[PDB]
Design brief:
Blueprint: E1 3-9, E2 18-22, H1 30-41, E3 53-56, E4 74-78
Parallel strand pairs: 1-4
Antiparallel strand pairs: 1-2, 3-4
Modified residues (Phosphotyrosine): 20
Protein name: Neuronal migration protein doublecortin
Domain Doublecortin: 3-89
């Protein structure tokens, strides 16, 4: 019942995302997911206040619940209430292995 979703960091052109297996069984709440994403995506140059917002890869909308997440889709994690429309990148030959 878990959904394979790719997460990127806002404004990072070099980072190719991390694959998560998402379900309400793995994460108690959406905050619990944002807490886990803060640990795995945050670093010295990225995410100053950790993961506080999730955007669709085109930055058209913000994701507020686990249900809003679609299987195999890519999302952008941010510390700020704005989307950095940078050229996000993927491998030419995929790797959809969970990192979770």
């Amino acid at each position: 019942k878990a959904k394979k979703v790719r997460f990127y960091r806002n404004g990072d052109r070099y980072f190719k995302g991390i694959v998560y297996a998402v379900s309400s069984d793995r994460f108690r709440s959406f905050d619990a997911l944002l807490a886990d994403l803060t640990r795995s995506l945050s670093d010295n140059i990225n995410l100053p206040q950790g993961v506080r917002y999730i955007y669709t890869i085109d930055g058209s909308r913000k994701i507020g619940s686990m249900d809003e997440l679609e299987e195999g889709e890519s999302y952008v994690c941010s510390s700020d209430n704005f989307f950095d429309d940078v050229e996000y990148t993927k491998n030419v030959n995929p790797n959809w292995s969970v990192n979770v």
